[PDB]
Design a protein around this nucleic acid. Sequence first.
DNA 1: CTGTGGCCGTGGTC
DNA 2: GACCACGGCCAC
Length: 756
Amino acid sequence: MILDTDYITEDGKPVIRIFKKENGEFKIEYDRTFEPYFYALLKDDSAIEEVKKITAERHGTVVTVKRVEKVQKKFLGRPVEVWKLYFTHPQDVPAIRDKIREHPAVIDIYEYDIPFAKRYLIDKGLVPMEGDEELKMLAFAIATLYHEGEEFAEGPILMISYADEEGARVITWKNVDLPYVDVVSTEREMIKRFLRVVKEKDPDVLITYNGDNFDFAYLKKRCEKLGINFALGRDGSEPKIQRMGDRFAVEVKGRIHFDLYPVIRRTINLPTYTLEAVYEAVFGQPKEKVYAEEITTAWETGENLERVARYSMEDAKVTYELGKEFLPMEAQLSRLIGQSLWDVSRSSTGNLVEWFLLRKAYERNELAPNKPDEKELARRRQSYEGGYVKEPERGLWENIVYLDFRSLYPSIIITHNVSPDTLNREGCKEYDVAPQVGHRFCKDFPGFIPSLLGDLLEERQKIKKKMKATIDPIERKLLDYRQRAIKILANSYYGYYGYARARWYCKECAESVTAWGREYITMTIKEIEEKYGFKVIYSDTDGFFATIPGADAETVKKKAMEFLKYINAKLPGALELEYEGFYKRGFFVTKKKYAVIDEEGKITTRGLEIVRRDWSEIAKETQARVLEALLKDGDVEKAVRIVKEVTEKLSKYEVPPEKLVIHEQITRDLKDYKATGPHVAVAKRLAARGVKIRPGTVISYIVLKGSGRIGDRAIPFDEFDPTKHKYDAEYYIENQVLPAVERILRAFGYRKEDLR
DNA sequence: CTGTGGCCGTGGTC
DNA sequence: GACCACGGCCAC
Ligand SMILES: Nc1ncnc2c1ncn2[C@H]1C[C@H](O)[C@@H](COP(=O)(O)OP(=O)(O)OP(=O)(O)O)O1
Ligand SMILES: [Mg+2]
Ligand SMILES: [Mn+2]
Ligand SMILES: [Mn+2]
């Protein structure tokens, strides 16, 4: 299979490198003939003679048109003949494309900003990660000597651990007597030893957890101190550290550096993303955490270094195990998008969609629309109306069915052929007209995007069917992640229509999808209520919770299935309402905030403080215990004993202050904030103290006893000392616990005074 | 930075 | 005290 592609320049000429594994053998294929190009639409074919002669300059080098080729293509489905302009080197295109566009005989140019190596994969029809090829994988991690107040990587690496199917080992330069620890003389020999292990094992995949932003950068600094050529690349190269957005990403040429952290971070919803939390979440087994402060003391005092080596060995072991489970998912995504696993595992959803569309457009002889310039961008900054959210019938409900449309917006796009190339196109026999917004969409031929979402939805449903029929809970959980990723991807094609930077931007298409969605859900609500006597309790965008008041579970389920058959017979195309769940009880607080319990006893909470990262653990812990007492049982009086059990304690300072930390992210330069909340107030002080605050920084703070603004008496939890500080017990009662649980316990007649 | 809809505490205004 | 914008995170 194809692992990756890039290009190098030899004597001014580009050379594509295709990194392959075939029949167990790694190969580098070199392609010296593939040429960069872009397209030009001319006022008249004869003008190509002048365009051929346009030249530019590129760092002392004259840039010229190598050769030209007239080709027949389509733009948004409409045929048009253009000129394919070839060049010698990819960097020729940015140097000359403006001068060609400015030429009076050139109407417009296209596809002039496509990365050369990805252009190769598309135009050659190559798809990475295709084939029955078994890839050799190796995980690794490092333990370092950390002292606070030091620059990055000022201390040495103490241990390098690695794990594969044959086991896990640890390399260190102190004498630890464990069977899996290899002792060397120096930090230098340790690094050189690890380099040797990788070259000998020759793995196709190097698995890390956050290696993009810690492990490789640490190794780089230490190798620069020690004078080590850290030639992990299969071409003898060192790891290529490059900027990606607001952080970094690391390539190892010829291999796939699979950094699990970006994948895990967007696939699983967790309060924290330590390696320990991720391992237990996936496999349901604990992993002990040894902290940097313990590692340093063990190394300096030589005491209990076995525990550090075990922790390091376990880091590599669980990293390998996690990589085995998540590579297949990312490998499928690589095939769907048609780009390398390295790229798809790290790229934004917009790039995935666009790389996908550029390939499909090439397959269909469709010219890609250009990205917008600054002027067009400013024109695309309007919004549009979205989904319909019903105000809930707040309170406690029983025998509730949840009906929900399958892949609604993608199904709308498929059903009504919602595409920029079908919008208000004249001459067609048939049209679908969007409600409210009135946009018309030709139905005579499949639209570009509509013709592509079908296969994604097909693949997802196949996964979901396999999932539901999977015995192993771990495999099932991974399939759940898999189908959910395609769900989010498919829905991102809708959002792509309203994405200001999109090539195939179409805000009319976007607001037509949402308009149809609002029509379908409100029609379904009216239909289930008027024809089947249901009561709709709450609805959001494309699903609703409903019951028959007074009916038992058997009856509600039966009549729900009857409505589904009826409504699904009326719905066109790919629109289908699904039976998504039955719940014995359910409590709805506001829009987007409710909790339901199924017949097995599993509670599902949405939007409530229990699920929010920016609320105090004691407030979430309390609301959870409250809901459990209400839904799982029926003992409202028990709920009120837990809460008064918590107000008392907080009053007595018997609650661990660790349950009082508030986490809130900094999202911008501190100068750019208009309003200073508690987390910004703390952040501004830390920066004054020299701490360096960047967007993405999380502020973990606690509120101390006082009366002024919250931010005034808020400090980082790193500075909390119970000897000197008494937290604001009345804040965490009146502002964290009570407000969360009161909104629920209202319905049972309780007020805040009866909970304190 | 795929999209819109929404809650709610905070710290301002009057 | 009523009110509002901000800001963060969450449901679709
Ligand atoms: N991340 C998102 N980006 C864009 N639109 C979204 C996103 N999440 C939800 N939506 C929109 C499009 C969805 O069709 C619609 C209803 O959401 P939802 O029911 O969660 O998903 P779905 O209908 O696409 O999948 P499913 O088959 O699981 O119901 O809301
Ligand atoms: Mg839904
Ligand atoms: Mn659904
Ligand atoms: Mn749905």
